């Protein structure tokens, strides 16, 4: 549960890390598909 909170702030810290390049304008579906990914790994870590 600490690992999810330490990694969810990293997803914010990398979606605001591209020097705000508007090329990748869609940071909405970046923190969507990488929050689903961090919840699928917490489930893998609980079951391990």
Cα 45 from Cα 8, distance rounded (Å): 16
C-alpha to C-alpha distance for 46 and 14, rounded to whole angstroms: 25
Give the method of determination. cryo-EM
Resolution of the determined structure in angstroms stands at 3.1
Q: Work out the number of other CB atoms within 10 angstroms of the CB of residue 37.
A: 11
Residue 6 CA to residue 8 CA, distance in Å, equals: 6
Residues in the chain: 48
23 vs 5: CA distance, rounded Å? 28
Tokens of 21: 């390049």
């Amino acid at each position: 549960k600490q690992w999810v909170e330490d990694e969810l702030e990293y997803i914010r810290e990398e979606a605001a890390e591209l020097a705000n390049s508007d090329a990748k304008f869609d940071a909405v579906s970046f923190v969507s598909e990488r929050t689903e990914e961090v919840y699928r790994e917490a489930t893998k870590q609980v079951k391990m």
